[PDB]
Amino acid sequence: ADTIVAVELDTYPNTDIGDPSYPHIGIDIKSVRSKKTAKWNMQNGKVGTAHIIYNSVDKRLSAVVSYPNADSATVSYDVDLDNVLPEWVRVGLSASTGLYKETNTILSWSFTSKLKSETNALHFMFNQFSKDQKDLILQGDATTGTDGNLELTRVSSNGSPQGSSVGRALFYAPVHIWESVASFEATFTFLIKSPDSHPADGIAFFISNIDSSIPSGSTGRLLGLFPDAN
Amino acid sequence: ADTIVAVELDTYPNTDIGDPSYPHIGIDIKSVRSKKTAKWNMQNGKVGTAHIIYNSVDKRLSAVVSYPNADSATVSYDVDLDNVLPEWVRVGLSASTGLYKETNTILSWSFTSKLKSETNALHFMFNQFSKDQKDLILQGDATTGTDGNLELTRVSSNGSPQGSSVGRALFYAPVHIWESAVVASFEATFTFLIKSPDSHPADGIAFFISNIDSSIPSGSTGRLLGLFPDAN
Amino acid sequence: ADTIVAVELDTYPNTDIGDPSYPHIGIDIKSVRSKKTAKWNMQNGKVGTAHIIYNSVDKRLSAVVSYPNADSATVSYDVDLDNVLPEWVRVGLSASTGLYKETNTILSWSFTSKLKTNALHFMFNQFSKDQKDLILQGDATTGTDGNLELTRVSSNGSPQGSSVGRALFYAPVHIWESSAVVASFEATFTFLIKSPDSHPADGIAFFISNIDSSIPSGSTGRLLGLFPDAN
Amino acid sequence: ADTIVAVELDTYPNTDIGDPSYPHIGIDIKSVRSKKTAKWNMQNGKVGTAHIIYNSVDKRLSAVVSYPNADSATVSYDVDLDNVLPEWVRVGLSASTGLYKETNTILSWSFTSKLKTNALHFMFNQFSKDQKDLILQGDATTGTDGNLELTRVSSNGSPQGSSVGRALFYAPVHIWESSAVVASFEATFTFLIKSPDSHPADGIAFFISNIDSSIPSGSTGRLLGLFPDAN
Ligand SMILES: OC[C@H]1O[C@H](OCc2cn[nH]n2)[C@@H](O)[C@@H](O)[C@@H]1O
Ligand SMILES: OC[C@H]1O[C@H](OCc2cn[nH]n2)[C@@H](O)[C@@H](O)[C@@H]1O
Ligand SMILES: [Ca+2]
Ligand SMILES: [Ca+2]
Ligand SMILES: [Ca+2]
Ligand SMILES: [Ca+2]
Ligand SMILES: [Ca+2]
Ligand SMILES: [Ca+2]
Ligand SMILES: [Mn+2]
Ligand SMILES: [Mn+2]
Ligand SMILES: [Mn+2]
Ligand SMILES: [Mn+2]
């Protein structure tokens, strides 16, 4: 079973398993039950910005989500990621739909990892995605090319999102993300678009065991990240 | 009077004005009396590294100081830099000797400011220093091009440091370091070599962020580290 | 008098002084008579891209000028920058109108110096009203739509003729040493040239000069804020 | 059979097959018979620096090899990389010994790819024993002194003859696209060739190939871990 650290963008509140009563960002450590959340005033059809940061000094996992000329949502939680995750990881985005649905649409994604024993580094930047985007490991329903974006869940030829969908995008190379100062910054832009009165289920940035894969039946409320609601 | 934010690498305990009784790091917000500090087992004649970090999400100004295969010292303080400094700053290193002295030798320095409204960026890297290093503003006793290093304080033609010295290096361009921001952030690193014949060296190195038009105050040698008008 | 290396987005054919008959890109080495040019189908009112590059191994100053979904214009030229420019320089953008006019809005500017390692990078995506890390010379202003207008624009948003302005980055840039294994720079910028005139004038240039460089008195029109005369 | 573009640090003159009469650097386009070479005074037991660069505007593959306080060696050649290599590639270092031998230890390695923007950068300043973001192939090991040993070294530190290894970075790299205003890469690395032989052999190269690229069976000695034969 995979070991998951994730920052979630949770559009659909599953109160029966812990979610607050509103859309919300939060920090997920080994569980879909967030260890901390904030209210996230999601904006249908609006392109948004997510930034995630962590360093081995403060060991504060932190993230912002915003739309232009609006109040951001902010969440942060103390984690020694070197204690929780393995030496090598992969970095990625995940998303899912259920009974309810939305487009889970990635217009850009960037990452920068620095380790200082002295310094090793990795950086990659996606402002567009192509149909055969060979430096991404695409899993589940994830495609690229159309147009020219990364789409995590299923969406029709005219742009209409489909329920009970799950997909992930992992950058191809593993990342050394702690050694016995270190830091990483992740940035992405997303476009959640839904005809439903309630959209679902949300996007996530995650860091996993190198050989992580979507768990069986992880559509909907489990975001492509988790075996179960535990 | 200049508005100073600083990370200090304090070699000489001046306990008459607040210092703990050991070499320490600390965070300096508008005062030479640190808001917080930690024990910095300084190593004489050893080349060490310093890394300073800050962001507008956590607003926690933090710094590490370390010598190869040894324990680093750590210090961090919660600070909304937008609330203390002006929009435009300049960023710098400073150092000072007094009765006691040391080489305050800079072997490398780097900086990265990111501000996201979207992104504006600033980076500069110094692995060596020429004699006419036109992108620094040298104040007081600071020279460049001996080895290819920045020397914040006075040192002889054969490398021997001198008492009652004070000097500063500042990068030429001013820096946007907060907007009214999705996220802002900066990282600063430098490598130093402190070397002294004294049994106690003094007074320390600082990394500093100031009003653009800041300079060394009158008589800020010693415990005042080139940064502060007074011991208040 | 200044030492100027410039790449020029020349919108107005001043054939009297060697311009081709059409709008051109061009490389400018101590003279407004470009040492080399190529043809640039400048699209009026379109945001374009430009990239400028050089290394001390090949010593080829090169430039691309582009509009989404159309063929780029390309120009390149062999010059030892160290034998022309002084050890320290400043970097900038310049623009001029004359009898005819155009807006010279800049939407973005970037730069990277490597000297081999010493390094320098700034990215401007948007410009504030008090953009303190830029030296503004002449008619140049910042803040309006968050951009850099090199030349004067009225409050109707329309361009005034016979104007000249420049933005230089505040920090001096070390652009060659005698002891370099490699040295290199990249410069990139986006612009927008909006003219109600039949023929817009006069163009944009990215430039590297002596640190103390200033707008040559009279440098409007064909002279692009760079050169005192047309020699 | 693999598609190979390489810049070769050729320590041994295999004159039988077009090597010059001295150690050289050189650009290898689908052949071990370098298209272009320059003389390189390789210094035994000393750390050196190699820089490799290309952009799609100039279409000029150039390379610099240097030692502190000695004249650099320089080589350069005109190739439209996109007419040679496929859309996607992997990047790497290769090395070989044959009858005579040298250590081929890499102290650091960097790379930057820019596609107009899509980008990729990695910096290796040190190599742990389980360096999972490198594909190791043949005799190559990591960790010992925190370094990358392309070829076999004994437990006394001595270089073994007739050896071959390669380090490819694990992520595919997109090194051209038909819709590129500008694409470019740079690669830097530091090496240390230590040989007790009168004549060290065979050399190090930085290479770009088809993503599925493998060591050619028998590619030791003069063939650098890159080419099936000397054709
Ligand atoms: O602004 C365009 C040009 O206007 C003026 O020249 C007009 C002209 C061209 N041929 N005959 N008259 C001058 O100001 C030039 O310097 C400008 O380039
Ligand atoms: O290792 C150096 C070379 O050794 C072998 O060739 C020996 C030789 C050359 N001329 N006469 N004998 C082969 O393995 C070559 O491929 C190597 O370059
Ligand atoms: Ca949910
Ligand atoms: Ca003190
Ligand atoms: Ca160290
Ligand atoms: Ca003209
Ligand atoms: Ca374009
Ligand atoms: Ca050979
Ligand atoms: Mn949730
Ligand atoms: Mn103190
Ligand atoms: Mn012209
Ligand atoms: Mn050869």
Side-chain angles (χ1 to χ4, degrees), chain C residues 8 10-14 17 19 24 32 202 221-224:
Chain C
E8 54 151 65
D10 201 323
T11 57
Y12 192 85
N14 295 271
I17 64 157
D19 278 344
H24 41 294
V32 75
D202 277 278
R222 58 192 193 186
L223 309 162
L224 311 164

Side-chain angles (χ1 to χ4, degrees), chain C residues 52-218:
Chain C
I52 303 89
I53 27 201
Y54 174 80
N55 61 65
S56 56
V57 179
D58 297 335
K59 300 172 177 182
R60 227 150 113 63
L61 190 56
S62 289
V64 205
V65 176
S66 190
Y67 283 106
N69 295 117
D71 302 319
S72 300
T74 233
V75 76
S76 303
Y77 188 71
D78 292 305
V79 210
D80 202 8
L81 279 188
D82 40 273
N83 209 241
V84 174
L85 304 174
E87 173 160 60
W88 291 91
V89 291
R90 276 206 174 77
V91 307
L93 305 159
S94 198
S96 70
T97 59
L99 176 55
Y100 305 108
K101 49 267 207 312
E102 72 197 23
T103 68
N104 297 111
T105 315
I106 290 275
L107 295 103
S108 83
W109 180 22
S110 43
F111 189 80
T112 326
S113 170
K114 286 108 141 317
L115 212 140
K116 347 228 39 262
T117 323
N118 275 32
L120 161 63
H121 174 77
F122 49 87
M123 176 143 51
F124 298 116
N125 270 8
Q126 51 96 146
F127 299 82
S128 56
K129 256 121 208 173
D130 209 302
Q131 199 54 75
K132 264 168 223 298
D133 58 359
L134 283 180
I135 312 187
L136 309 193
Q137 300 186 328
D139 290 344
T141 47
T142 66
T144 54
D145 299 52
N147 305 137
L148 164 71
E149 300 277 14
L150 294 173
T151 47
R152 194 147 309 291
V153 187
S154 276
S155 51
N156 76 343
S158 82
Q160 315 204 303
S162 263
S163 170
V164 54
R166 327 204 295 195
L168 304 94
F169 178 66
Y170 204 83
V173 185
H174 198 170
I175 211 70
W176 54 270
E177 205 145 27
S178 310
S179 321
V181 175
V182 224
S184 60
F185 77 80
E186 34 210 312
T188 60
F189 67 90
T190 59
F191 57 106
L192 172 42
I193 300 200
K194 187 81 190 64
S195 181
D197 307 39
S198 282
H199 310 264
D202 277 278
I204 297 158
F206 155 90
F207 81 111
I208 304 166
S209 64
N210 49 299
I211 58 169
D212 65 341
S213 154
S214 120
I215 295 167
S217 180

Side-chain angles (χ1 to χ4, degrees), chain A residues 206-225:
Chain A
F206 74 79
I207 304 183
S208 60
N209 57 302
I210 251 137
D211 59 323
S212 161
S213 300
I214 302 159
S216 163
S218 53
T219 56
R221 52 154 182 245
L222 294 176
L223 291 172
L225 303 172

Side-chain angles (χ1 to χ4, degrees), chain C residues 22-39:
Chain C
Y22 37 75
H24 41 294
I25 68 177
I27 301 168
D28 290 8
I29 307 281
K30 290 151 87 181
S31 150
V32 75
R33 283 165 208 265
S34 308
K35 303 309 198 202
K36 199 142 181 297
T37 66
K39 179 175 206 281

Side-chain angles (χ1 to χ4, degrees), chain A residues 180-202:
Chain A
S180 222
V181 187
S183 52
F184 77 78
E185 61 162 281
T187 263
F188 69 89
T189 63
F190 58 89
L191 172 44
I192 301 194
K193 174 69 138 187
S194 201
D196 300 10
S197 199
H198 302 250
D201 279 81

